[PDB]
Amino acid sequence: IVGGKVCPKGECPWQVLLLVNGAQLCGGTLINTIWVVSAAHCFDKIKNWRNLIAVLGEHDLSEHDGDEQSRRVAQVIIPSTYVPGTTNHDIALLRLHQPVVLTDHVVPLCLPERTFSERTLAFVRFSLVSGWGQLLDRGATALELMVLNVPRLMTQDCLQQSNITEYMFCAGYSDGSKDSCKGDSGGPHATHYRGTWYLTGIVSWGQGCATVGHFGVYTRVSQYIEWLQKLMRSEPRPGVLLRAPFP
Template identity: 45%
Template sequence: MYTAVDHCLASPCKNGATCTRLLDTYVCKCLPGFHGQHCDRARRTSHGCHYKNGECEHFCRHLPDRSHVCFCAPGYRLHQDAISCMAEGEAACGRTVTRFTPRVINGKICPKGQCPWQALLTEHNVFSCGAIVLSDRWVLTAAHCVWRKPATVFNVTVGEHDLNEDERTEQKRRVVKVLIHHDYNKSSSDSDLAMLKLHRPVKLGLYVVPICLPARNSSFGRALSSVRHSTVSGWGRLSRFGPAAGILQRLMLPRVPLQECRLHTKLNITTNMLCAGLKAGGQDACEGDSGGPLVTRYKKTWFLTGVVSWGKGCANKNLYGVYVRVSNFLSWIENIMSNF
């Protein structure tokens, strides 16, 4: 005669959970605040996502029972530890593939492969602006770079590093669609964003990697803003009347509160903008960098926080650089990428 073992007699369920006996096994029904097979893992409910981003490597979302879960950017899967994000393929967004030991970067060359989301926008084959790789078919730039011009005059180059050398990593594509944000205001520079669709996909890899976008409807904005410094890159002019840099530059800058930015620039800074730079001047994105990325590293992954919009002159004292605040435009960006 067969007798089923009652596993519940051994009290396998912890933290006040209820044990339900099944044929040859059991399930634990956890009390709120606990999870895991034996309800032995506490959900970090006390502060949820607001404390250390819920310890999540990427994004954190609150659940109705006041607990929270971690989730990852597209192209990553959540590790069994329920916190870490594992890249699923080559060229997962926001991760540089080339091995490089970072040094302090103040207006120095961006080593090849370390700014792989940087793209170059040319108009009639002349360098006009920076742009940002979002996928193999879409790049983002500033609206004023493409305002009232047909798509046919533009090309985008990715995998570019030294403008004066053919490095055999460059991929050039025609632009077939220009979508300027519907609220773009030329005089105030508000909502200064445009999406560009390429005529055929670029090949992602060592030197071409999309940047990650922050998640909508998560507390990740708060986590990103806790990282004080962001990095801007581009081939813009190195000084006010100087030549454009031949080699891609990058620069680490502290972000500046809007009130302080308004105070020191005496300019109309809207909530769709963010400021970065040093009050003493001397280091900032310069002309020709419009449309380029301002990126922020959270743990091991880089996320897009701003798009270079404008600044009064190059690195003038008390004049911060102004960027489009990308977090306000995530729905618009994602809608275009999925529907056009």
Template identity: 35%
Template sequence: TASRIVGGSEASRGEFPWQVSLRESNEHFCGAAILTEKWLVSAAHCFTEFPDPAMWAAYTGTTSIRGSDSGTVKMGIARIIPHPSYNADTADYDVAVLELKRPVTFTKYIQPVCLPGAGHHFPTSKKCLISGWGYLKEDFLVKPEFLQKATVELLDQTLCSSLYSHALTDRMMCAGYLEGKIDSCQGDSGGPLVCQEPSGKFFLAGIVSWGIGCAEARRPGVYTRVTKLRDWILDAISA
């Protein structure tokens, strides 16, 4: 029940410069976002099966799943640090940080996303953006050639909790549409949900975590709520 983008459109180069493709044994497996020159943030559930950093590589600066464009930078992973409270059964605390083997150089196509403050308010029904190379349809296991993006609405927590029989915790948030049609899907997991503020800056509001199906009615995507975990993220990357 991970996530992919259904009902989206192709992203242009440099539109999501913080987007990372995490490859396990050279296959795109999850998304991530650039926090600093040395650190990425993703979902803890991406690494339960493959916890060894040596099996992973991060592709940055590209919108192509093959990583074939000229600005692509392939990075090795030195460490994977999942949240110590991550619970695989409930998907609570679904966040991990990844340390790169060497710092990445920022370019027009490689930039960090802004981490929100703990008190940063992302209002209900705000329109935000998801991006990833996940499946384009739920039961149609085709991954796109180029990075996909979609606009989703932040949903009311109480409403979303009721749709998921109260399985939501404070570390989760929902985005999408009650009628379905647009959502993240398998392969988008760990990728960013970003919201643009009036300053023009994009802030990381959520991390693609789980859902039931993809783009189904009354089954919106569930994301790790970054404001609740930013203190841990900052501690982990500065330790």
């Protein structure tokens, strides 16, 4: 995250850190005690699918404070329409091996109904994006979780002000000062409405970040609510990766 602030410990309690062989891979969002939403592209190059870990309650990566909860990732579900190394359909649903325990530091973000998200949330101007990604373009990643308030653009307005599909949206700033960045992919774009926060976007990717003339690109979660809900009602299948039809 470029140009944000430290998320005070416990104020982003749905944020997930994904690790592969102990190394930072991506962010994610907790939506229930065993389900995490992330970005499909995070998994394009995984060799050993059995060394993926999700960490909840993380804040400062330099220390252990006892609020962290680690779980193995049992399933990574990706839409059939996602093509590796691209932006369209950049979403993954992850099933944890064992539920996390909800605590003051570990709380799911609400996955909204489609109608509500389309009719109401999509018109809330500012939303929060968070992660342990780079603090600057071509810079070091953050040790403390960072958060940034970004405004959402209508797609016509994105294209004028800069292919953005109906499965994406733009949000952020075009002056290079404030953006999501490498290391933040998969993390939440969370939208507040009448006292509750909802998942509306997933940090996707682009070439570099905080680039004058360019906005951050987010997966438009409202297009996937039904797809996610059906999968969360399904039984697990052997083998970590699952490609599931979309729609």
